[PDB]
Amino acid sequence: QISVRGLAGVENVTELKKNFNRHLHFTLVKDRNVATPRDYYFALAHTVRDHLVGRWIRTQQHYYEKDPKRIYYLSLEFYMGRTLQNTMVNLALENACDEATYQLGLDMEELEEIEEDAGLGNGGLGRLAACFLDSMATLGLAAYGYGIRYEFGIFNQKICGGWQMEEADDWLRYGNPWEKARPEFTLPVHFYGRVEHTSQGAKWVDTQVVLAMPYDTPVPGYRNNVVNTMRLWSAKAPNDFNLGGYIQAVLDRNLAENISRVLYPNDNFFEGKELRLKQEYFVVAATLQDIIRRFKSSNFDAFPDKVAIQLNDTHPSLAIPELMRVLVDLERLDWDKAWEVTVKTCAYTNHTVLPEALERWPVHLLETLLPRHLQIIYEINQRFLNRVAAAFPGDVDRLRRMSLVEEGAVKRINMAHLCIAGSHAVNGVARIHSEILKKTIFKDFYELEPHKFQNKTNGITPRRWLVLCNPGLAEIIAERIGEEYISDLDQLRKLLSYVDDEAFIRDVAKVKQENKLKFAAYLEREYKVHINPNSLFDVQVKRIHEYKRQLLNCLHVITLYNRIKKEPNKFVVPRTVMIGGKAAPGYHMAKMIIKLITAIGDVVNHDPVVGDRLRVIFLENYRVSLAEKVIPAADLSEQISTAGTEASGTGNMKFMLNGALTIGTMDGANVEMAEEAGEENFFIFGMRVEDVDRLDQRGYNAQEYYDRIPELRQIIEQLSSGFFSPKQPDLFKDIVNMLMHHDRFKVFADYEEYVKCQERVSALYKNPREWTRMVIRNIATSGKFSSDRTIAQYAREIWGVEPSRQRLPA
Amino acid sequence: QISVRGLAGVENVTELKKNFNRHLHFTLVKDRNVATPRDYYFALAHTVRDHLVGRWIRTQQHYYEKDPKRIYYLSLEFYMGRTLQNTMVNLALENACDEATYQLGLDMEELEEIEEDAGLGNGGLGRLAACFLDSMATLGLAAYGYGIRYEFGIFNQKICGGWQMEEADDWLRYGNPWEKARPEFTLPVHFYGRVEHTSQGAKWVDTQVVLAMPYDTPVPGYRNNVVNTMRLWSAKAPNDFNLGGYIQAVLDRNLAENISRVLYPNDNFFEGKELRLKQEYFVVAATLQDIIRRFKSSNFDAFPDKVAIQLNDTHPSLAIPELMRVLVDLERLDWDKAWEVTVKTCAYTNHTVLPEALERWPVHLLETLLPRHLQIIYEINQRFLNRVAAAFPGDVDRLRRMSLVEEGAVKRINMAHLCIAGSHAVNGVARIHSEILKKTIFKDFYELEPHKFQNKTNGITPRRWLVLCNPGLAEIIAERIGEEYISDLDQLRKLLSYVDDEAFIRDVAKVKQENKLKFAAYLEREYKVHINPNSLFDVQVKRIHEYKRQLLNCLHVITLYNRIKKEPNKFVVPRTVMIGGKAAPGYHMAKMIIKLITAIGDVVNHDPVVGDRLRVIFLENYRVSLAEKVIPAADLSEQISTAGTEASGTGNMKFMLNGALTIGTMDGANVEMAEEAGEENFFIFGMRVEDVDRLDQRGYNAQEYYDRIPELRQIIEQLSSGFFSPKQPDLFKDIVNMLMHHDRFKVFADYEEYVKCQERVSALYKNPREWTRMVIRNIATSGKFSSDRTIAQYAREIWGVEPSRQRLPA
Numbered sequence A, B: 001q002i003s004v005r006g007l008a009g010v011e012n013v014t015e016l017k018k019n020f021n022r023h024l025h026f027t028l029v030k031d032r033n034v035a036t037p038r039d040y041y042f043a044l045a046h047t048v049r050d051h052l053v054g055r056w057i058r059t060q061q062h063y064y065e066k067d068p069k070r071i072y073y074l075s076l077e078f079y080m081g082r083t084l085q086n087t088m089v090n091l092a093l094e095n096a097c098d099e100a101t102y103q104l105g106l107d108m109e110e111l112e113e114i115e116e117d118a119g120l121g122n123g124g125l126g127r128l129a130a131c132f133l134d135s136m137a138t139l140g141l142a143a144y145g146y147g148i149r150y151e152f153g154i155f156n157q158k159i160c161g162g163w164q165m166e167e168a169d170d171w172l173r174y175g176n177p178w179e180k181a182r183p184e185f186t187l188p189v190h191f192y193g194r195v196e197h198t199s200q201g202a203k204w205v206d207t208q209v210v211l212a213m214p215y216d217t218p219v220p221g222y223r224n225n226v227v228n229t230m231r232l233w234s235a236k237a238p239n240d241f242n243l244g245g246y247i248q249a250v251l252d253r254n255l256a257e258n259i260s261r262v263l264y265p266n267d268n269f270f271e272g273k274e275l276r277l278k279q280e281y282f283v284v285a286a287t288l289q290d291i292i293r294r295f296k297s298s299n300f301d302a303f304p305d306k307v308a309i310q311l312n313d314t315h316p317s318l319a320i321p322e323l324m325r326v327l328v329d330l331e332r333l334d335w336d337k338a339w340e341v342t343v344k345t346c347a348y349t350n351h352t353v354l355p356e357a358l359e360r361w362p363v364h365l366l367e368t369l370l371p372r373h374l375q376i377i378y379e380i381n382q383r384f385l386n387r388v389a390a391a392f393p394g395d396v397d398r399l400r401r402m403s404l405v406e407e408g409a410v411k412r413i414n415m416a417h418l419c420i421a422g423s424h425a426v427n428g429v430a431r432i433h434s435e436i437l438k439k440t441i442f443k444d445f446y447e448l449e450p451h452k453f454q455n456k457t458n459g460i461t462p463r464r465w466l467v468l469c470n471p472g473l474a475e476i477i478a479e480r481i482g483e484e485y486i487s488d489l490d491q492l493r494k495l496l497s498y499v500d501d502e503a504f505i506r507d508v509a510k511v512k513q514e515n516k517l518k519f520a521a522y523l524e525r526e527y528k529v530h531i532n533p534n535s536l537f538d539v540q541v542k543r544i545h546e547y548k549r550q551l552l553n554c555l556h557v558i559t560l561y562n563r564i565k566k567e568p569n570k571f572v573v574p575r576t577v578m579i580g581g582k583a584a585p586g587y588h589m590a591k592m593i594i595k596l597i598t599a600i601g602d603v604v605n606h607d608p609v610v611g612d613r614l615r616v617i618f619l620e621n622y623r624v625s626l627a628e629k630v631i632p633a634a635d636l637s638e639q640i641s642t643a644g645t646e647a648s649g650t651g652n653m654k655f656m657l658n659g660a661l662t663i664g665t666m667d668g669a670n671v672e673m674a675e676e677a678g679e680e681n682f683f684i685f686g687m688r689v690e691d692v693d694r695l696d697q698r699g700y701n702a703q704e705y706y707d708r709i710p711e712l713r714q715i716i717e718q719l720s721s722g723f724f725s726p727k728q729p730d731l732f733k734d735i736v737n738m739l740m741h742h743d744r745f746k747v748f749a750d751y752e753e754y755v756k757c758q759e760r761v762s763a764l765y766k767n768p769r770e771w772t773r774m775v776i777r778n779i780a781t782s783g784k785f786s787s788d789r790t791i792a793q794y795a796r797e798i799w800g801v802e803p804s805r806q807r808l809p810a
Ligand SMILES: O=C(CCCc1ccc2c(c1)CCCC2)N[C@@H]1O[C@H](CO)[C@@H](O)[C@H](O)[C@H]1O
Pocket: A122, A123, A124, A125, A128, A264, A265, A266, A267, A268, A269, A270, A271, A313, A351, A352, A357, A358, A429, A458, A646, A647, A648, A649, A650, A668
């Protein structure tokens, strides 16, 4: 149908049809008489998978022949979403499979909906790793993603009586056709035990063993025949494990295998839980043995020339002392040489500044679980602090600030300090964030080793986040400027010369309208929800956290409602306000915020005076597959975190690429987005980082704002008095209390500017032609935010490898 | 190479080779450069599996079209062993696959050794179910085997310092290419809760739910294109199960899923464990929903015309009250009509007379776990006892003897009594056993309902137990009498006319010699054990139990040793005595017996005066795949249980078919074997059942035998004094104590007759020609012991269906 979806050749369509029937018969053991749509999905997935394997085998053979420097991206999260469509896109098979399935009497889009998300992440950090894998393959890098194969990913969210309920995400129930188990590369991982000192060095003995079994998933590059590997480890008990009586010993194997059972959902809130530490060591120990094995199958002086390890936050930070352990205790390198190799091999990416998100492990846990690692960490600390002392003599305060060991009630190890000490590069994820790291929380480290500190502004893959989710937009762009922009997104700048083209303006607006109709219908179908598709689609989707300020959005929604009720016969631009996202199960305030949003909906959506002028919908179970639907449909993207709190953001970039305008604070990557598009083409409001600092110096007093802004006072009185919870009038008292007395994120301080900025949005939306022209200026300048640009920068400035756009042969 | 292995056509060999390469590439994702022998095994298994699926689909379609009466064989155990060779045999593919793999530079026999046993049983009962499935498919019956997919089957046995050690049988580690998961036919199973009585009947409410997910394995008939199904259930937690905190709730899913984790290994010893009861109900509840679903997809008056349920012992006895529950509580049939349907549907096979093997569940367990079933069982009991009272008025003792409820310290339900009450047929498994049931333990029931009681003498499948394991013997037989005997084993009688044929005599003896050389070499290869292949191979393999009297064998071994030491320069027929089998992990006496056997080996095998005249070897990890190797190599089969204790035996039949002579008591099927071959062609010794009864009446006094038999006294003095355990002189005191004071199985009473009979064996073995002639007379009369004969009898006399030997079309 559309050109960017590739060719449907007679030969290709014929071959796909016959391979589909082969799999249905031999693989699934069904015939057309009893087959369900799920059977048909699986037959298609196996058919597409067959096209990967030749390229997969020869890519890995190629790396063996050429022996390039290998990049190892270590992460506890890979938020991959669905794989079928992505694979078809990257292999140029979409139109062919569409034709083939159509000729079999099947609708491919219906089959696509059957696949489960691989929801092995919480949000931005996990999704970044997934975008990165796609870009690394597209740029021809010899890259491997390493993580954990969780049996249960991020929970499925149900809303019952306006409250979040969690259920287990049993994503593997029907099988996963994309992975290949590799039980033959199973490796042992050690826990507990004790350290013995011999004449011939230290020995870690009397350990418990858990096995790490790998599962490999292919990662196809865009139309270059490169297929890289994501290797995820699964925990297995050894067969003599624990070996009445006999029965209980077999049942107790679950203790070991629980390591890979479930993803922790409490993102941005560190807890010192033993099981989480076991997960972190498990991925690190198995991965490093795999790395060393592959390196030997070609003297460790050359190790950093052949290996780069990228740490996705501190979660895999134990790689540093584990590499030292292996080099010193097993390979018998002297300490100094091992440390040189380690530093040159490892690099660390920081993704947070909130103090409660930093990993600070109690020493007593490390002592029991990983006694040799604690010893190595103490030794690293002593040598590092000796360097600090020599560079800043007499500065005893600096010594305690920079220590890897935190003194206090409970002694803790600061894993961020360990990563900085043990890495040759440390980066933040947007310019403002990287500057904040050097000026505040890692100031001391920057003063000691300025050369370590870099910026790598985040990005998103334009394959999933434009071609896959918004083919209509991809097509009208390709009509004007060709197809090359899909792997060179800076070419979108060429669209500036169409900002006054009447045909293009109409097509851009038509594509948005079609997306909005499609989404409005999805809403009715799957959730009996009933929206006006002519309204402005005002969308805030991301995890629920106080710093992200879903509450500020709520205050605006109630302001609009109150204004309508005050002057009901006045014209207002109609809106559909959609808020979505998961709350961490133990985060009470986040759970109350979800309840508030649904409670506002209950009042607003049933008030006959409002009509269809305002609707408030909570988008249930926000995840990658839902993002692919709602983002192309959005008019307005809400990026309204308190300045200094969102390290980068990546949802922001997805909305920009798909034709929404942005209302946002000067936080994270919003700053660079506004800089690229022009501030006149962005709806910027609120305190800058400098203003937040000034307020903190004086002291934030929320009462001052309540006293001076009558519209705000009205809302607080409504919340307090039970207007939004008539049967339980005190329901939202915790929210009101926090807002008035303990608000770390200064919701009231940006309220007035936010409401005024929202008025300017509504004014522009009344003039469709000028709205759309501003959209074109956003899409056209979104090129910097391709993860291909990001990865090219990691490759040249951190890993020391050159990207390539050249095809491997088919 | 050999004719019974089928044709190696050019077209077939070419197609197999290309499909093998296809699977290696696309299925396994390997190439010839990195492939291991395990990869090659899997490529072959997938290639052979492809040949099953067409026949599997069309067999099941055929049953849907014709709607024949369906046979459901319910068992907690299916001891299947390996599947690759069996599949090749039944599909006539063995020579073709041999040729194909040879042309690829691979040895097929080496690849066969890589497959794990499906060890989902303990011994005879589990293996009988497997032989039965093979015969039911071969006889064209619409039969389904239903059981539990244990994650861990019978433990792997290691011997360390002469002691049994257990390790988990992780048989699914590398995957199982034969099974097909069917998550779409998942069914709920209920536990706990309570019963509510409404006006509209009883209701079972407030239950915990566990899901039963089926996995289907194909069961091919012999060269008839029938492929039946074995459906095994796996336990899964529902996704809201139990739904910090959140993490613990996800980890606690293991509680539910433990139901299918592990096979209980304590055969012949009943324990009232809750988990075992859960397993029993799980298989019954899921299976019966499946049965009813299939019946409706065509009024319950016709249910027994379309359904037969065979209970493999009492382990699935809850089928009776579950069927009543469904018919009465859910389908709203009146009690009497439901009971009529149930009785006509169900039939029960008894496999034991030892009292400690009978299932007698504490009422308090049923009360908590299955409260509605207990109510139904009480109601069944009251109505049954009312019939007993009317037939035998005033006989109050009979009422308490026949009750399903056993009064005492703890009240118990006798599941055997429940099965007899609720079944239209009850059978034993050999003539003597079925007679014992009517005369002793079920005498009262036989007097009430004589028509229910039948015999069905056990059998073994001649596919696995001759063609597969002993192709050399199968071939020399086929040369004389053709191939038809493989599915009509009575044709072996034709071999009687070759008992004086010099060519045949030589070939029979040559085949045995080759088998013995092959096994002697397997022993050296895999266990550094070093045997004389000219010796008589004297073999006792079966689970270790006091009733089976491995101890009697031990006493003979020590007698032979002592006789040699007494007259070392006298000639004796050389022997290799092999004993093998697993002991239940908590059965102390069985564990001591294994230790005694290895301890005797330690002395005998290193005594220079003995030389190679006597060797004693303990065969480690006895299982189906090992039976297939040792049985074809055996000269003498030890079947020496105390008369009245072995219900049938089936190992006995395997040895007879493969050219070993039998030394045995008149117990179980030995009686019928001797009757078929002629007592003159069997080595029968010892007390008959009647003699054991006479001894019990007088009182068994072991001291009497010790006092009168000097050779026996010598052995007991050697055991007691530490001759076989010099560093631990009191090691075997428990054994000596049991033998002298508490021997339920009268080992001493058969000692003298056993030793004398063994002398007659040695005399015959000195005359190879006459030994071999007696062998031919055994092989020639083994036809009755085909499980095809057994199943034909179940079909006609219990299930009411006619067997068929007719092909389905290919
Ligand atoms: O997600 C994170 C920080 C990870 C924090 C964290 C802390 C503790 C725990 C988790 C995650 C996961 C569960 C266990 C405990 N940062 C986000 O990274 C995105 C990609 O760089 C960035 O766009 C977001 O601004 C930043 O909040």
